[PDB]
């Protein structure tokens, strides 16, 4: 079985820059190599076949080159929508085999998060649980720290974070942090606060509310 290797799991670039991704086969496959692009929640999309041939509809900025064992995939001018995982594949022998993929990630200017806090809804409380949601909207870079405080008590192990993929237009990230308590316990406390530190914030930002107000 032919092994297809993409050494870089992640590759980073900027809008308008040139970027190149490498793929190696452990067997001389001449030019029997295809390249695929896969965006979040989508099926792979064929970009290049036979190492250098552009498939129908692929934009001109996508090129492939190489022969033998060392193949290269290039984007001449990176665009915001180009965020994706890129896979090489040999179509030289059976079984068909794929590289591990290289995720493309865009550099951009620092962007400080927009922070919102949502109390549990009445409808959720009537059901017995209480989820408090802290939302960090359209920031960069990805690195962000969220701390929950309940009547000035730091929370640990009580919350779960979720982050979106890099936005295909502004290349920012968004993040949700969800603190879950029982109804009885939520009603035992007054002040609910989430504190956010991010490279774009000169000083930590706090959003809070008082149960009842």
């Amino acid at each position: 079985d032919i092994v297809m290797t993409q050494s870089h799991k992640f590759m980073s670039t900027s809008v308008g820059d040139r970027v190149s991704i490498t793929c190696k086969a452990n067997h001389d496959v001449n030019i029997a190599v295809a390249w695929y692009q896969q965006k979040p929640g989508q099926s792979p999309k064929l970009l290049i076949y036979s190492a250098s041939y552009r498939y129908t509809g692929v934009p001109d900025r996508f090129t492939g080159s190489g022969s033998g064992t060392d193949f290269t995939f290039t984007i001449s001018s990176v665009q915001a929508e180009d965020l994706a995982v890129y896979y090489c594949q040999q179509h030289y022998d059976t079984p068909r085999t794929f590289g591990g993929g290289t995720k493309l990630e865009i550099k951009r200017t620092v962007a400080a998060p927009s922070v919102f806090i949502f109390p549990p809804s009445d409808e959720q409380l009537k059901s017995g649980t209480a989820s408090v949601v802290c939302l960090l909207n359209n920031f960069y870079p990805r690195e962000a720290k969220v701390q929950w405080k309940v009547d000035n008590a730091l929370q640990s192990g009580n919350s779960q974070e979720s982050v979106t993929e890099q936005d295909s237009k502004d290349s920012t990230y968004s993040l949700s942090s969800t603190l879950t308590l029982s109804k009885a316990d939520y009603e035992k406390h007054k002040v609910y606060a989430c504190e956010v530190t991010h490279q774009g914030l000169s000083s930590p930002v706090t959003k809070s509310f008082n149960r009842g107000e």
């Binding site: 099926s43 036979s50 591990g100 927009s114 649980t129 909207n137 779960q160 979106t164």
Partner: protein, 211 residues
């Protein structure tokens, strides 16, 4: 146009089996074979094999019915390792080699003994707002298995929408949120409804979110 449509997400208990379907349209089914593939976060894209239209060794059985224009893939005694997204795909033209151009949307297979459970949809109401921007959302709580889809105003609202990847809770149920940001000046001029579809439990919910 050539189109491959795959069956819906599946929940399979360990040791059971499931048959996956790929309906084809837009060509003579007998002229092209269908390729099957498996995608996981750890093992990546893996080719399984091909359904001959005139008809992973022990795990996969590949078949096809020309009368329904449908390719089939039965997965045998399933384990946690068979939890994945499965694609069917087709070569672009008659004399092409094995490069894949026409792909199905993928079928998610969850291998688990847990029970399927439809979600509850709670609103995340807007209040007093980063200057000129307000935020609202829906909390889709405690469902199983994946996946869930969320749109806003029947799909007519796409700007400012962020649907977060689900987290798995210690209970063994999933939970996610979908938020949209809108200009503050729009808060009291338009209705905001999140549409939630969890096909594995045949749950469809339209939920208004009011400030």
């Amino acid at each position: 146009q050539v189109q491959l449509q795959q069956s819906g997400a599946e929940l399979v208990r360990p040791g059971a089996s499931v048959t996956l379907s790929c309906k084809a349209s837009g060509y003579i089914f007998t002229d092209y074979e269908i390729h099957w593939l498996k995608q996981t976060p750890v093992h990546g894209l893996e080719w399984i094999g091909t359904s001959d239209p005139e008809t992973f060794k022990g795990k996969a059985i590949l078949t096809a019915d020309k009368s329904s224009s449908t390719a089939y893939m039965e997965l045998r005694s399933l384990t946690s390792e068979d939890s994945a997204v499965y694609y069917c795909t087709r070569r672009p033209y008659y004399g092409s080699g094995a490069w894949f151009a026409y792909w199905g949307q993928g079928t998610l297979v969850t291998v688990s003994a847990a029970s399927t459970k439809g979600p509850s949809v709670f609103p995340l109401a807007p209040s007093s707002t980063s200057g000129g921007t307000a935020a609202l959302g829906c909390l889709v709580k405690d469902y199983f298995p994946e996946p869930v889809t969320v749109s806003w105003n029947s799909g007519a609202l796409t700007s400012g929408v962020h649907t977060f990847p689900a987290v798995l809770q210690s209970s063994g149920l999933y939970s996610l949120s979908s938020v949209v940001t809108v200009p503050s000046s729009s808060l009291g001029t338009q209705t905001y409804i999140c549409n939630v579809n969890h096909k594995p439990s045949n749950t469809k919910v339209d939920k208004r979110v009011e400030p």
